[PDB]
Amino acid sequence: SHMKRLEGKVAIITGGASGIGASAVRLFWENGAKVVIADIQDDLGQAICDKLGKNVSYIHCDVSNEDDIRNLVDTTVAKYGKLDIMFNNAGIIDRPYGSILDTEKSDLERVLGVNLVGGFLGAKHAARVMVPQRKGCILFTASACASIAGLGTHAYTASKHAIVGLMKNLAAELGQHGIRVNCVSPYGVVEAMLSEVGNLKGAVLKVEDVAQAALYLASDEANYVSGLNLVVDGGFSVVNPSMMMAL
Amino acid sequence: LVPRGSHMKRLEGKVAIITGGASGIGASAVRLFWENGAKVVIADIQDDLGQAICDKLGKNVSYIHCDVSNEDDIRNLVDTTVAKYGKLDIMFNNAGIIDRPYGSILDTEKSDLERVLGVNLVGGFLGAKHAARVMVPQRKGCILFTASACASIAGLGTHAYTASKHAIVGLMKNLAAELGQHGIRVNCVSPYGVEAMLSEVGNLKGAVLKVEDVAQAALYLASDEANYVSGLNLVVDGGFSVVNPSMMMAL
Amino acid sequence: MKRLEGKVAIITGGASGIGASAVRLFWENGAKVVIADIQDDLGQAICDKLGKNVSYIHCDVSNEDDIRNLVDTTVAKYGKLDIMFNNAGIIDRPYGSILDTEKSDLERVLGVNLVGGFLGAKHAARVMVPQRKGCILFTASACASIAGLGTHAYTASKHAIVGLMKNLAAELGQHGIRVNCVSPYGVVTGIGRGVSEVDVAQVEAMLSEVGNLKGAVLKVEDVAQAALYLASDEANYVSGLNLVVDGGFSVVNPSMMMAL
Amino acid sequence: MKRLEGKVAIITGGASGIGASAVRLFWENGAKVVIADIQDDLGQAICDKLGKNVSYIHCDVSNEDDIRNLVDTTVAKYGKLDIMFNNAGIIDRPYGSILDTEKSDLERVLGVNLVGGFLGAKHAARVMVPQRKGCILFTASACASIAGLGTHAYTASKHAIVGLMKNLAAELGQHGIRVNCVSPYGVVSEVDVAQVEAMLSEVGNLKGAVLKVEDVAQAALYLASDEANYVSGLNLVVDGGFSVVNPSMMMAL
């Protein structure tokens, strides 16, 4: 016997056509939610719609464009009459690694535009429709890089810290309206180095791990969870193992 | 093409010990873990209450008298559990006490601080040590603590209580670092919940903390769905500990 | 005395506020001080007041050309750069809802607060790494430690600065460079489009009423003193530190103590 | 020059290590310093060397009667107490597994580190609340900021201290009293300890520098002085950035 942990819920998932987003689309759909996929990869997005069927729709959305975000939220509410979950998952990386001496102003702005501005716009317009409902859940995909240095580039790390901080500040403002705000912060595998240097040996981060954290946070199981940075990194961001490794 | 949900027995096959399991959060978690297919050992010092849960829930739930500050009690709790079921999957160090709901450092008795520490910190220490004893040779396991939202913000608990729960968070993270080498996850759940005032001054309007909220956080952490969650302080407080609302309220 | 003897420091936003306090304090402690700002009259006034050891450069911290010139001119003047204090910062509003926050406002705040900090750290690192020494400082804010204090755009940008500061502490520690930030309470902003002086006064007045540390009021000197400790050799092993100056506001939710 | 002129400071653990470094440094900046320790001979040698503005009180910080005597005599000597520096601390081991931690060892580390700080802040608050002024300091540890650095018993006790510091900052701020801690990187048998200190200096984040006791005393001096008049609730970490980074990825490249 099985259960639908999101029955009747309406969820928007940016970056939903691939990776963590698509995993969360499939999982939310499995748990009875109507899912709006928001992305810029129309071929992938529409394919998920054809696979899963009527409860899933695709909308082209550049999250850095406020008009796209407005259309995304407004057509979803028009379609389904309500918005329960805004999952600002879309993200990009400027580089795997690199020095501050070599970062370009334009790359930093591109990473900020998608990661921070997009999540900001997504939260603004979800709050726009959620506040009159007196209920809702706003989620962000942050990153373990927001909890510890040495995991990402300076631009990416700065952008993800900003998301976590935006998360806490929105939980403070929107709590008065019954709206919960949280984020999920994964380690890697958005495997070789990650699994070897990771803290939890014998485990590997899979996209489903992030989706399942988002599912918990988005469900009524998390009815009193707000302001939480739900880190999914096997404990990587709580340790500096330089001593253990040298003992 | 047809949605199929999550299986209702998320802890099927797992063996879990819940200290403080005879009332409150612990009893809520016992019932929820039982509903999810776990074998559950209630560890407490309220024997009549704990056995009444077992009589209601049946054979998958048993009771063990355990003062968590007593290492012999903890050792026996872990050892009887392994003898009964062959393994230990989840060690939920939930038992906790308070010296007072509130009070000044000037009033705080040394003996009260020590009793709060014995149960909350030393007991959690002992429970983790003996869970790890059997858990390291399995190369798997989940060790949990009930900490408190007062480990994330001041103004919510007494000094003794708040200090003991910070210690638990620190212990959780240190243990996540050591035992991760053996595949073992370590996390805590930090609940918000004088109770009438906590509900009025909470950050999340339109909802009140109920013990099932905490049980659900513990279920998530204990489940294989959280297989890459370690070192996490899972706060369940509606945002209370992320905000100083003094100036919001002065606008 | 003279905790910064012979040291060369750049202070963005140095013509007013905390920046101007830090300019004076560093100068009293023997530093050469380059003021970087866009209030030319105010900055030249300070230069005329303090003498040869203090100099002014018109600098838009969001402009990389400006930052590149500010660093290189400083090096050409004094042959080294010891302290880069990325203090310039603006708010969009003293308070306000996410629902009426404008994209352009967020982008403007990011441009000064985050991109300007990024650019300042980049060009300081360019000359400090060969030195195998240097100290890079940011003025963040107490709102990077607690919600309820700044707007969403401002708070996000200051969290971003704290993250940058820690990430730079990890990269630049290998070269002997320390990176820290100071995070004050109160309302902290230079001149900015649509920043009312009435609204700032009203909020600064409320913040002094609801502060945690009674009997004291935060002054610009308090923040300058924190920057001076961090910049001095007395902080030789201090890096990655968010030095919060807020009287304890960000560690407490006093809703229970108030209601009791 | 003298950054603590007129101030009266108690420094537990003041006869050696960080405590003795702070005792010297505070005295050099004009403070009256009461050394509180259980190394009577070392502590009295400091007093003889520095003169009558420095005194010694035998005090086991886990004993309340010792703590009360310490505070009360200090106030009797000088009429006030400005700074309560709860610096005394012990480790159980340099490093070890949870599997071999002994209950008694954990209780002893808690007794000195946490209960001692608790008691010292209690009786300091007793005298500074009527003054409507004071600064209460703790020596915590960088291992309260990151895992992998201290043993479980030590780390738990220093986390507890950081949380006590913040909770006191909240209660006592209404009386104008500031509460902060300093959290040093170093480990601070003797060879056991030196081995780990040497290893810490090899794996530190900040290259070209080593933590010295004077670094920690300097952080305490800043926090104790009027230069930090609006600093409360602060965990002043002194660790060259070690606790903000996991270099595992950097190092594998």
PDB file of N, CA and C in Angstrom, chain A residues 64-66 98-101 103-105 108-109 112 116-117 120-121 123-124 127-128 131 148-150 152-155 157-158 161-162 164-166 168-170 172-174, chain C residues 62-64 96-99 101-103 106-107 110 114-115 118-119 121-122 125-126 129 146-148 150-153 155-156 159-160 162-164 166-168 170-172:
ATOM      1  N   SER A  64      15.754  34.737 -15.129  1.00  0.00           N
ATOM      2  CA  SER A  64      16.310  36.075 -14.949  1.00  0.00           C
ATOM      3  C   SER A  64      15.434  37.159 -15.568  1.00  0.00           C
ATOM      4  N   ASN A  65      14.406  36.770 -16.324  1.00  0.00           N
ATOM      5  CA  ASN A  65      13.482  37.682 -16.984  1.00  0.00           C
ATOM      6  C   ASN A  65      12.201  37.787 -16.165  1.00  0.00           C
ATOM      7  N   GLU A  66      11.915  38.974 -15.624  1.00  0.00           N
ATOM      8  CA  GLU A  66      10.739  39.077 -14.763  1.00  0.00           C
ATOM      9  C   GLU A  66       9.440  38.847 -15.531  1.00  0.00           C
ATOM     10  N   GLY A  98      38.533  28.097  -9.716  1.00  0.00           N
ATOM     11  CA  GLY A  98      39.354  29.160 -10.256  1.00  0.00           C
ATOM     12  C   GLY A  98      39.637  30.231  -9.235  1.00  0.00           C
ATOM     13  N   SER A  99      40.672  31.011  -9.523  1.00  0.00           N
ATOM     14  CA  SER A  99      41.131  32.068  -8.638  1.00  0.00           C
ATOM     15  C   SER A  99      40.314  33.346  -8.802  1.00  0.00           C
ATOM     16  N   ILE A 100      40.243  34.132  -7.718  1.00  0.00           N
ATOM     17  CA  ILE A 100      39.664  35.475  -7.783  1.00  0.00           C
ATOM     18  C   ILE A 100      40.435  36.354  -8.757  1.00  0.00           C
ATOM     19  N   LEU A 101      41.703  36.039  -9.011  1.00  0.00           N
ATOM     20  CA  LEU A 101      42.480  36.855  -9.925  1.00  0.00           C
ATOM     21  C   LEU A 101      41.977  36.726 -11.357  1.00  0.00           C
ATOM     22  N   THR A 103      38.595  35.835 -12.237  1.00  0.00           N
ATOM     23  CA  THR A 103      37.155  35.923 -12.437  1.00  0.00           C
ATOM     24  C   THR A 103      36.825  37.188 -13.210  1.00  0.00           C
ATOM     25  N   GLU A 104      35.910  37.061 -14.158  1.00  0.00           N
ATOM     26  CA  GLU A 104      35.478  38.177 -14.983  1.00  0.00           C
ATOM     27  C   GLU A 104      34.177  38.760 -14.451  1.00  0.00           C
ATOM     28  N   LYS A 105      34.093  40.093 -14.462  1.00  0.00           N
ATOM     29  CA  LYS A 105      32.905  40.779 -13.968  1.00  0.00           C
ATOM     30  C   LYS A 105      31.648  40.241 -14.628  1.00  0.00           C
ATOM     31  N   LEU A 108      30.499  36.776 -13.216  1.00  0.00           N
ATOM     32  CA  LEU A 108      29.875  36.956 -11.914  1.00  0.00           C
ATOM     33  C   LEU A 108      28.447  37.462 -12.063  1.00  0.00           C
ATOM     34  N   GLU A 109      28.226  38.399 -12.990  1.00  0.00           N
ATOM     35  CA  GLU A 109      26.891  38.939 -13.205  1.00  0.00           C
ATOM     36  C   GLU A 109      25.954  37.887 -13.788  1.00  0.00           C
ATOM     37  N   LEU A 112      25.064  35.574 -10.888  1.00  0.00           N
ATOM     38  CA  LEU A 112      24.112  36.287 -10.039  1.00  0.00           C
ATOM     39  C   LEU A 112      22.743  36.401 -10.701  1.00  0.00           C
ATOM     40  N   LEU A 116      20.738  34.194  -8.189  1.00  0.00           N
ATOM     41  CA  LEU A 116      20.156  35.048  -7.162  1.00  0.00           C
ATOM     42  C   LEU A 116      18.952  35.828  -7.685  1.00  0.00           C
ATOM     43  N   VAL A 117      19.119  36.563  -8.781  1.00  0.00           N
ATOM     44  CA  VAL A 117      18.020  37.387  -9.273  1.00  0.00           C
ATOM     45  C   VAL A 117      16.829  36.506  -9.636  1.00  0.00           C
ATOM     46  N   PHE A 120      15.122  35.334  -6.598  1.00  0.00           N
ATOM     47  CA  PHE A 120      14.455  36.514  -6.069  1.00  0.00           C
ATOM     48  C   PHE A 120      13.161  36.804  -6.822  1.00  0.00           C
ATOM     49  N   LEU A 121      13.222  36.817  -8.148  1.00  0.00           N
ATOM     50  CA  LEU A 121      12.014  37.059  -8.928  1.00  0.00           C
ATOM     51  C   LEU A 121      10.985  35.961  -8.698  1.00  0.00           C
ATOM     52  N   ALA A 123      10.541  34.060  -6.062  1.00  0.00           N
ATOM     53  CA  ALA A 123       9.915  34.213  -4.753  1.00  0.00           C
ATOM     54  C   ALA A 123       8.981  35.414  -4.722  1.00  0.00           C
ATOM     55  N   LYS A 124       9.353  36.510  -5.389  1.00  0.00           N
ATOM     56  CA  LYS A 124       8.488  37.688  -5.383  1.00  0.00           C
ATOM     57  C   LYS A 124       7.125  37.368  -5.986  1.00  0.00           C
ATOM     58  N   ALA A 127       5.111  34.785  -3.856  1.00  0.00           N
ATOM     59  CA  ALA A 127       4.554  35.502  -2.718  1.00  0.00           C
ATOM     60  C   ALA A 127       3.385  36.370  -3.152  1.00  0.00           C
ATOM     61  N   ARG A 128       3.482  36.989  -4.337  1.00  0.00           N
ATOM     62  CA  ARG A 128       2.386  37.816  -4.839  1.00  0.00           C
ATOM     63  C   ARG A 128       1.061  37.060  -4.806  1.00  0.00           C
ATOM     64  N   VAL A 131       0.381  35.180  -0.768  1.00  0.00           N
ATOM     65  CA  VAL A 131      -0.036  35.982   0.387  1.00  0.00           C
ATOM     66  C   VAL A 131      -1.554  36.061   0.506  1.00  0.00           C
ATOM     67  N   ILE A 148      30.098  26.263   3.582  1.00  0.00           N
ATOM     68  CA  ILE A 148      31.519  25.979   3.760  1.00  0.00           C
ATOM     69  C   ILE A 148      32.264  26.445   2.517  1.00  0.00           C
ATOM     70  N   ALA A 149      33.461  26.979   2.731  1.00  0.00           N
ATOM     71  CA  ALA A 149      34.307  27.406   1.628  1.00  0.00           C
ATOM     72  C   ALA A 149      35.129  26.236   1.101  1.00  0.00           C
ATOM     73  N   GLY A 150      35.573  26.380  -0.147  1.00  0.00           N
ATOM     74  CA  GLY A 150      36.411  25.389  -0.780  1.00  0.00           C
ATOM     75  C   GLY A 150      35.675  24.442  -1.693  1.00  0.00           C
ATOM     76  N   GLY A 152      33.083  25.616  -4.116  1.00  0.00           N
ATOM     77  CA  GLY A 152      32.727  26.216  -5.387  1.00  0.00           C
ATOM     78  C   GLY A 152      33.503  27.492  -5.653  1.00  0.00           C
ATOM     79  N   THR A 153      33.359  27.996  -6.883  1.00  0.00           N
ATOM     80  CA  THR A 153      33.967  29.271  -7.237  1.00  0.00           C
ATOM     81  C   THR A 153      33.419  30.393  -6.350  1.00  0.00           C
ATOM     82  N   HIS A 154      34.117  31.529  -6.376  1.00  0.00           N
ATOM     83  CA  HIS A 154      33.709  32.660  -5.546  1.00  0.00           C
ATOM     84  C   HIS A 154      32.343  33.203  -5.951  1.00  0.00           C
ATOM     85  N   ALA A 155      32.081  33.311  -7.260  1.00  0.00           N
ATOM     86  CA  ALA A 155      30.790  33.819  -7.728  1.00  0.00           C
ATOM     87  C   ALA A 155      29.654  32.891  -7.327  1.00  0.00           C
ATOM     88  N   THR A 157      29.646  30.590  -4.933  1.00  0.00           N
ATOM     89  CA  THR A 157      29.512  30.538  -3.485  1.00  0.00           C
ATOM     90  C   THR A 157      28.820  31.784  -2.971  1.00  0.00           C
ATOM     91  N   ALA A 158      29.220  32.952  -3.479  1.00  0.00           N
ATOM     92  CA  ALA A 158      28.560  34.178  -3.053  1.00  0.00           C
ATOM     93  C   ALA A 158      27.076  34.136  -3.402  1.00  0.00           C
ATOM     94  N   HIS A 161      25.250  31.688  -0.910  1.00  0.00           N
ATOM     95  CA  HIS A 161      25.066  32.335   0.388  1.00  0.00           C
ATOM     96  C   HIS A 161      23.902  33.315   0.322  1.00  0.00           C
ATOM     97  N   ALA A 162      23.834  34.100  -0.760  1.00  0.00           N
ATOM     98  CA  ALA A 162      22.774  35.095  -0.881  1.00  0.00           C
ATOM     99  C   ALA A 162      21.405  34.429  -0.877  1.00  0.00           C
ATOM    100  N   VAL A 164      20.545  31.514   0.583  1.00  0.00           N
ATOM    101  CA  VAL A 164      20.237  31.097   1.949  1.00  0.00           C
ATOM    102  C   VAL A 164      19.785  32.295   2.775  1.00  0.00           C
ATOM    103  N   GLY A 165      20.473  33.432   2.630  1.00  0.00           N
ATOM    104  CA  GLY A 165      20.071  34.614   3.372  1.00  0.00           C
ATOM    105  C   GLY A 165      18.717  35.147   2.928  1.00  0.00           C
ATOM    106  N   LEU A 166      18.462  35.137   1.616  1.00  0.00           N
ATOM    107  CA  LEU A 166      17.149  35.539   1.114  1.00  0.00           C
ATOM    108  C   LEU A 166      16.060  34.637   1.692  1.00  0.00           C
ATOM    109  N   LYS A 168      16.099  32.977   4.604  1.00  0.00           N
ATOM    110  CA  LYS A 168      15.762  33.292   5.986  1.00  0.00           C
ATOM    111  C   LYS A 168      14.938  34.572   6.078  1.00  0.00           C
ATOM    112  N   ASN A 169      15.291  35.577   5.283  1.00  0.00           N
ATOM    113  CA  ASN A 169      14.597  36.853   5.368  1.00  0.00           C
ATOM    114  C   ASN A 169      13.157  36.718   4.890  1.00  0.00           C
ATOM    115  N   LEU A 170      12.935  35.943   3.832  1.00  0.00           N
ATOM    116  CA  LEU A 170      11.571  35.711   3.363  1.00  0.00           C
ATOM    117  C   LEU A 170      10.770  34.889   4.365  1.00  0.00           C
ATOM    118  N   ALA A 172      10.955  35.135   7.436  1.00  0.00           N
ATOM    119  CA  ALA A 172      10.566  36.099   8.457  1.00  0.00           C
ATOM    120  C   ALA A 172       9.396  36.960   7.988  1.00  0.00           C
ATOM    121  N   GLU A 173       9.483  37.518   6.779  1.00  0.00           N
ATOM    122  CA  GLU A 173       8.387  38.357   6.297  1.00  0.00           C
ATOM    123  C   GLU A 173       7.130  37.527   6.049  1.00  0.00           C
ATOM    124  N   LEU A 174       7.274  36.383   5.391  1.00  0.00           N
ATOM    125  CA  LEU A 174       6.090  35.691   4.897  1.00  0.00           C
ATOM    126  C   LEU A 174       5.444  34.781   5.939  1.00  0.00           C
TER     127      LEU A 174
ATOM    128  N   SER C  62      31.516  49.833  -8.488  1.00  0.00           N
ATOM    129  CA  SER C  62      30.964  48.880  -9.451  1.00  0.00           C
ATOM    130  C   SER C  62      31.682  48.921 -10.793  1.00  0.00           C
ATOM    131  N   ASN C  63      32.525  49.923 -11.017  1.00  0.00           N
ATOM    132  CA  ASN C  63      33.288  50.074 -12.252  1.00  0.00           C
ATOM    133  C   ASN C  63      34.674  49.460 -12.094  1.00  0.00           C
ATOM    134  N   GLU C  64      34.991  48.461 -12.922  1.00  0.00           N
ATOM    135  CA  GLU C  64      36.281  47.792 -12.755  1.00  0.00           C
ATOM    136  C   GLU C  64      37.430  48.713 -13.134  1.00  0.00           C
ATOM    137  N   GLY C  96      11.134  46.962   3.804  1.00  0.00           N
ATOM    138  CA  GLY C  96      10.135  46.852   2.758  1.00  0.00           C
ATOM    139  C   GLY C  96       9.934  45.424   2.313  1.00  0.00           C
ATOM    140  N   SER C  97       8.772  45.196   1.719  1.00  0.00           N
ATOM    141  CA  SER C  97       8.305  43.860   1.379  1.00  0.00           C
ATOM    142  C   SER C  97       8.935  43.351   0.089  1.00  0.00           C
ATOM    143  N   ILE C  98       9.011  42.026  -0.033  1.00  0.00           N
ATOM    144  CA  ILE C  98       9.459  41.445  -1.294  1.00  0.00           C
ATOM    145  C   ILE C  98       8.487  41.797  -2.419  1.00  0.00           C
ATOM    146  N   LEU C  99       7.208  42.022  -2.092  1.00  0.00           N
ATOM    147  CA  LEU C  99       6.201  42.242  -3.125  1.00  0.00           C
ATOM    148  C   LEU C  99       6.416  43.543  -3.892  1.00  0.00           C
ATOM    149  N   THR C 101       9.545  45.055  -4.095  1.00  0.00           N
ATOM    150  CA  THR C 101      10.947  45.197  -4.456  1.00  0.00           C
ATOM    151  C   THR C 101      11.091  45.120  -5.972  1.00  0.00           C
ATOM    152  N   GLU C 102      11.838  46.066  -6.535  1.00  0.00           N
ATOM    153  CA  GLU C 102      12.080  46.126  -7.967  1.00  0.00           C
ATOM    154  C   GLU C 102      13.343  45.358  -8.333  1.00  0.00           C
ATOM    155  N   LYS C 103      13.312  44.696  -9.490  1.00  0.00           N
ATOM    156  CA  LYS C 103      14.522  44.058 -10.003  1.00  0.00           C
ATOM    157  C   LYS C 103      15.686  45.044 -10.104  1.00  0.00           C
ATOM    158  N   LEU C 106      17.363  45.625  -6.757  1.00  0.00           N
ATOM    159  CA  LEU C 106      18.234  44.521  -6.377  1.00  0.00           C
ATOM    160  C   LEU C 106      19.527  44.568  -7.173  1.00  0.00           C
ATOM    161  N   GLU C 107      19.428  44.861  -8.468  1.00  0.00           N
ATOM    162  CA  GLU C 107      20.629  44.857  -9.286  1.00  0.00           C
ATOM    163  C   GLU C 107      21.553  46.000  -8.891  1.00  0.00           C
ATOM    164  N   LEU C 110      23.201  44.948  -5.550  1.00  0.00           N
ATOM    165  CA  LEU C 110      24.225  43.953  -5.848  1.00  0.00           C
ATOM    166  C   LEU C 110      25.458  44.607  -6.471  1.00  0.00           C
ATOM    167  N   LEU C 114      28.013  43.839  -3.687  1.00  0.00           N
ATOM    168  CA  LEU C 114      28.653  42.559  -3.976  1.00  0.00           C
ATOM    169  C   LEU C 114      29.684  42.677  -5.096  1.00  0.00           C
ATOM    170  N   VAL C 115      29.266  43.168  -6.266  1.00  0.00           N
ATOM    171  CA  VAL C 115      30.198  43.259  -7.383  1.00  0.00           C
ATOM    172  C   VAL C 115      31.363  44.173  -7.019  1.00  0.00           C
ATOM    173  N   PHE C 118      33.646  42.222  -4.780  1.00  0.00           N
ATOM    174  CA  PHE C 118      34.348  41.286  -5.656  1.00  0.00           C
ATOM    175  C   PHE C 118      35.500  41.966  -6.390  1.00  0.00           C
ATOM    176  N   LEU C 119      35.200  43.086  -7.056  1.00  0.00           N
ATOM    177  CA  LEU C 119      36.202  43.789  -7.850  1.00  0.00           C
ATOM    178  C   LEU C 119      37.332  44.306  -6.971  1.00  0.00           C
ATOM    179  N   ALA C 121      38.350  43.082  -4.087  1.00  0.00           N
ATOM    180  CA  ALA C 121      39.166  41.952  -3.656  1.00  0.00           C
ATOM    181  C   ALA C 121      40.018  41.415  -4.800  1.00  0.00           C
ATOM    182  N   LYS C 122      39.463  41.366  -6.009  1.00  0.00           N
ATOM    183  CA  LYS C 122      40.226  40.880  -7.154  1.00  0.00           C
ATOM    184  C   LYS C 122      41.496  41.700  -7.355  1.00  0.00           C
ATOM    185  N   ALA C 125      44.023  41.442  -4.422  1.00  0.00           N
ATOM    186  CA  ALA C 125      44.730  40.172  -4.550  1.00  0.00           C
ATOM    187  C   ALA C 125      45.777  40.207  -5.658  1.00  0.00           C
ATOM    188  N   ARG C 126      45.533  40.965  -6.733  1.00  0.00           N
ATOM    189  CA  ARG C 126      46.497  41.016  -7.830  1.00  0.00           C
ATOM    190  C   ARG C 126      47.853  41.526  -7.356  1.00  0.00           C
ATOM    191  N   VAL C 129      49.076  39.107  -3.622  1.00  0.00           N
ATOM    192  CA  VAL C 129      49.650  37.767  -3.769  1.00  0.00           C
ATOM    193  C   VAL C 129      51.156  37.815  -4.012  1.00  0.00           C
ATOM    194  N   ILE C 146      21.020  37.768  10.936  1.00  0.00           N
ATOM    195  CA  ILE C 146      19.683  37.545  11.462  1.00  0.00           C
ATOM    196  C   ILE C 146      18.703  38.157  10.484  1.00  0.00           C
ATOM    197  N   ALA C 147      17.533  37.538  10.361  1.00  0.00           N
ATOM    198  CA  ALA C 147      16.501  38.149   9.536  1.00  0.00           C
ATOM    199  C   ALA C 147      15.728  39.172  10.353  1.00  0.00           C
ATOM    200  N   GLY C 148      14.971  40.018   9.645  1.00  0.00           N
ATOM    201  CA  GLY C 148      14.165  41.041  10.264  1.00  0.00           C
ATOM    202  C   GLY C 148      14.828  42.398  10.363  1.00  0.00           C
ATOM    203  N   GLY C 150      17.238  43.932   7.626  1.00  0.00           N
ATOM    204  CA  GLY C 150      17.367  44.642   6.372  1.00  0.00           C
ATOM    205  C   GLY C 150      16.318  44.177   5.375  1.00  0.00           C
ATOM    206  N   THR C 151      16.269  44.857   4.229  1.00  0.00           N
ATOM    207  CA  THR C 151      15.393  44.387   3.163  1.00  0.00           C
ATOM    208  C   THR C 151      15.941  43.091   2.574  1.00  0.00           C
ATOM    209  N   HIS C 152      15.155  42.495   1.676  1.00  0.00           N
ATOM    210  CA  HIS C 152      15.594  41.240   1.080  1.00  0.00           C
ATOM    211  C   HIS C 152      16.768  41.464   0.140  1.00  0.00           C
ATOM    212  N   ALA C 153      16.741  42.539  -0.654  1.00  0.00           N
ATOM    213  CA  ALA C 153      17.862  42.789  -1.554  1.00  0.00           C
ATOM    214  C   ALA C 153      19.130  43.080  -0.768  1.00  0.00           C
ATOM    215  N   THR C 155      19.882  42.337   2.454  1.00  0.00           N
ATOM    216  CA  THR C 155      20.290  41.152   3.219  1.00  0.00           C
ATOM    217  C   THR C 155      20.972  40.131   2.316  1.00  0.00           C
ATOM    218  N   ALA C 156      20.400  39.871   1.136  1.00  0.00           N
ATOM    219  CA  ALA C 156      21.017  38.921   0.215  1.00  0.00           C
ATOM    220  C   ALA C 156      22.428  39.360  -0.152  1.00  0.00           C
ATOM    221  N   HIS C 159      24.790  38.777   2.921  1.00  0.00           N
ATOM    222  CA  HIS C 159      25.104  37.346   2.980  1.00  0.00           C
ATOM    223  C   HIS C 159      26.112  36.966   1.898  1.00  0.00           C
ATOM    224  N   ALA C 160      25.922  37.485   0.675  1.00  0.00           N
ATOM    225  CA  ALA C 160      26.859  37.199  -0.408  1.00  0.00           C
ATOM    226  C   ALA C 160      28.270  37.666  -0.054  1.00  0.00           C
ATOM    227  N   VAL C 162      29.559  37.973   3.018  1.00  0.00           N
ATOM    228  CA  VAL C 162      30.097  37.051   4.027  1.00  0.00           C
ATOM    229  C   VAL C 162      30.599  35.770   3.360  1.00  0.00           C
ATOM    230  N   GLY C 163      29.835  35.242   2.399  1.00  0.00           N
ATOM    231  CA  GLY C 163      30.282  34.055   1.684  1.00  0.00           C
ATOM    232  C   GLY C 163      31.537  34.304   0.871  1.00  0.00           C
ATOM    233  N   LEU C 164      31.581  35.428   0.151  1.00  0.00           N
ATOM    234  CA  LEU C 164      32.800  35.764  -0.568  1.00  0.00           C
ATOM    235  C   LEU C 164      33.978  35.876   0.392  1.00  0.00           C
ATOM    236  N   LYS C 166      34.565  34.432   3.241  1.00  0.00           N
ATOM    237  CA  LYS C 166      35.055  33.131   3.697  1.00  0.00           C
ATOM    238  C   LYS C 166      35.744  32.380   2.569  1.00  0.00           C
ATOM    239  N   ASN C 167      35.154  32.411   1.365  1.00  0.00           N
ATOM    240  CA  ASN C 167      35.750  31.726   0.221  1.00  0.00           C
ATOM    241  C   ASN C 167      37.099  32.322  -0.155  1.00  0.00           C
ATOM    242  N   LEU C 168      37.242  33.645  -0.028  1.00  0.00           N
ATOM    243  CA  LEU C 168      38.530  34.280  -0.286  1.00  0.00           C
ATOM    244  C   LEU C 168      39.528  33.966   0.823  1.00  0.00           C
ATOM    245  N   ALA C 170      39.834  31.214   2.245  1.00  0.00           N
ATOM    246  CA  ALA C 170      40.348  29.892   1.934  1.00  0.00           C
ATOM    247  C   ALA C 170      41.307  29.938   0.751  1.00  0.00           C
ATOM    248  N   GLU C 171      40.988  30.717  -0.287  1.00  0.00           N
ATOM    249  CA  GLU C 171      41.907  30.783  -1.419  1.00  0.00           C
ATOM    250  C   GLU C 171      43.169  31.549  -1.048  1.00  0.00           C
ATOM    251  N   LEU C 172      43.010  32.715  -0.437  1.00  0.00           N
ATOM    252  CA  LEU C 172      44.152  33.599  -0.262  1.00  0.00           C
ATOM    253  C   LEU C 172      44.985  33.272   0.965  1.00  0.00           C
TER     254      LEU C 172
END
